[PDB]
Write a protein that binds this ligand. Structure first.
Ligand SMILES: CN1CCC(c2ccc(-c3ccc4c(c3)C(=O)N([C@@H](C(=O)Nc3nccs3)c3cc(F)ccc3O)C4)cc2)CC1
Ligand SMILES: CN1CCC(c2ccc(-c3ccc4c(c3)C(=O)N([C@@H](C(=O)Nc3nccs3)c3cc(F)ccc3O)C4)cc2)CC1
Ligand SMILES: Nc1ncnc2c1ncn2[C@@H]1O[C@H](COP(=O)(O)OP(=O)(O)NP(=O)(O)O)[C@@H](O)[C@H]1O
Ligand SMILES: Nc1ncnc2c1ncn2[C@@H]1O[C@H](COP(=O)(O)OP(=O)(O)NP(=O)(O)O)[C@@H](O)[C@H]1O
Ligand SMILES: [Mg+2]
Ligand SMILES: [Mg+2]
Lengths: 288, 288
């Protein structure tokens, strides 16, 4: 339990390159140098843009131990922490970056089988988080990291993203996460489009009350767009459960081209078991 | 089966830094760039110092598929290959380097619990290789790679190292590997000493026939030096099996200071479950 979150010294890791920033901190690629060792281990380091107090660190630690406790192939685990003036959090470095940026830069080489499997994997991770009774509160294509193209994990859970929140959050339940899951799915199926592009956030809750939802992405059949609309029902309990989302997106993943119309989908593919085994043993030794 | 050894193009990986060389090839740290992807994945690349023919590549591939087929936490798996004029082999990059260099550079911070566990892990991997009916033929502290300080794996098996070979090899059986295991153990317990230092290789088989073995390392009790001597029996079948080596070195690992006398052993230690979990999730996601 307590053994799941390593407390680090400043002197045993170094931030070497910035990777990006959110409205909570800045993310660096970093090197972890174990005491007495001559090696340099690449890590990801989030340093909060908000310097803290020692009593406030008691809040941070109380949640950090929980996020260090997740054990699921499609959920990122918080690994370490260094409680400087500004707190730094450490996790596994994902060289493929987030899924949002990934789809935007590969939108012309992304097939139906990859898209659909990603929706399954993200759902498995949300279903795990629900079984641990952890509400994500910030699910987005930006907070889905790519370990390998075949393997995605969910990050930055358990901590406003108005365009991703349920109407009752603009209340955070697992059913409110289901909403954010639908928005994440829409981001993938639109190859990274910005939801409600150009509409100011202060006015999203208005358009949701009048019945407007995100439009059907061009590559979605009705079976896929039905699911996304169901995630955006005003009644939270009427939304589909994550356990069900797994079942339906797995069904569609065994016949992908039936449920996603993508130009050049017979050229786009999935890696031969030859390429997957080479992927996993180099970067992704997790079971799966 | 065939899906366990990825064939690579030249254009999808690059050698960026040399790491060392043996009398068979040169090892580089390399970057694997997946087709269509914008990331750079660190790998290890062995390029043979011997340019080959296409029919000779049929030999190489026939063995490479076997080495790509090992599934054991303490055995390195061959992952890929690029069959240029000089063949390049690819495997997971171990930033901690080999165990030989590791012990030499940490000899003043290495305790009995680490040394003994390493002997267990190396034995587990040799016991696996015996169960797959693969003779190592070049077991040494140089060919034991450090994934993390707590986790070592055996490399470069299944391909002369006179000072590591059994007398009947100077015949390669699993019992001849047991000999090389004893020599590997002696290398660790001597914090990286060179076996038979200063004695020319052409004259090692002579000294072995007259009964000379490696000396008892200063930190070994008799129980440990008894095992090492048993690995060097002239009768191969009289040597202990790897299955037994596991049992005896595990026994000694539950009471390490009873079997290894190391100055400052109460200061040297093992990482708290806090530090191990941080190690594994960053670098070593294998089960164990
Ligand atoms: C300021 N005033 C006083 C103090 C209060 C406060 C309460 C809690 C935190 C806290 C604690 C723990 C975390 C986070 C935040 C967080 O953002 N965390 C991510 C994560 O670290 N991401 C990464 N990117 C790259 C490298 S590390 C994360 C990673 C992961 F693998 C799984 C879940 C997860 O949440 C972990 C901070 C401040 C707030 C109000
Ligand atoms: C020249 N004339 C004609 C041709 C004949 C020939 C026959 C077989 C090979 C062959 C095939 C396969 C391998 C090896 C050698 C080998 O050296 N291999 C290691 C390995 O690649 N190490 C690494 N270091 C860093 C990056 S890759 C290795 C790695 C591992 F993870 C597990 C086992 C293993 O053996 C694999 C070459 C030539 C010989 C005589
Ligand atoms: N483990 C990781 N490995 C590599 N890059 C990462 C990792 N975690 C986050 N990033 C990237 O670091 C950048 C900053 O992340 P972050 O601070 O979380 O902002 P954000 O995810 O875009 N918005 P938010 O997470 O909702 O605050 C993004 O481009 C992420 O993809
Ligand atoms: N996977 C790996 N990751 C990092 N370094 C490695 C890896 N495999 C080998 N090395 C290192 O690369 C260097 C060259 O290795 P190698 O070519 O095997 O020579 P050697 O092991 O010292 N002698 P030999 O293996 O018996 O031919 C050594 O310093 C090894 O520790
Ligand atoms: Mg993020
Ligand atoms: Mg070697």
């Amino acid at each position: 339990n307590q053994a799941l979150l390593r407390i680090l010294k400043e002197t045993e890791f170094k931030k070497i390159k910035v990777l990006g920033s959110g409205a909570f901190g800045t993310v660096y690629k970093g090197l972890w140098i174990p005491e007495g060792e001559k090696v340099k281990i690449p890590v990801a380091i989030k340093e909060l843009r908000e310097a803290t107090s020692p009593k406030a660190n008691k809040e941070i630690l109380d949640e950090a131990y929980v996020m260090a406790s997740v054990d699921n192939p499609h959920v990122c685990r918080l690994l370490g922490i260094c409680l400087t003036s500004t707190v730094q959090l450490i996790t596994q470095l994902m060289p493929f970056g987030c899924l949002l940026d990934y789809v935007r830069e590969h939108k012309d080489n992304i097939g139906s089988q990859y898209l659909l499997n990603w929706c399954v994997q993200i759902a498995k991770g949300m279903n795990y988080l629900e079984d641990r009774r952890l509400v994500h509160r910030d699910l987005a294509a930006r907070n889905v990291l790519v370990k390998t193209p075949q393997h995605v994990k969910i990050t930055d859970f358990g901590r406003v993203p108005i365009k991703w929140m349920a109407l009752e959050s603009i209340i955070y339940t697992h059913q409110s996460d289901v909403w954010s899951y639908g928005v994440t799915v829409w981001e993938l199926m639109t190859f990274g489009s910005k939801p409600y592009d150009g509409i100011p956030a202060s006015e999203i809750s208005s358009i949701l009350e009048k019945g407007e939802r995100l439009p059907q992405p061009p590559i979605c059949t009705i079976d896929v767009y039905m699911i996304m609309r169901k995630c955006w029902m005003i009644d939270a309990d009427s939304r589909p459960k994550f356990r069900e989302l797994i079942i339906e997106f797995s069904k569609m993943a065994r016949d992908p081209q039936r449920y996603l119309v993508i130009q050049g989908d017979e050229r786009m593919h999935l890696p031969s078991p030859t390429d997957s085994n080479f992927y996993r043993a180099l970067m992704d030794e997790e079971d799966m």
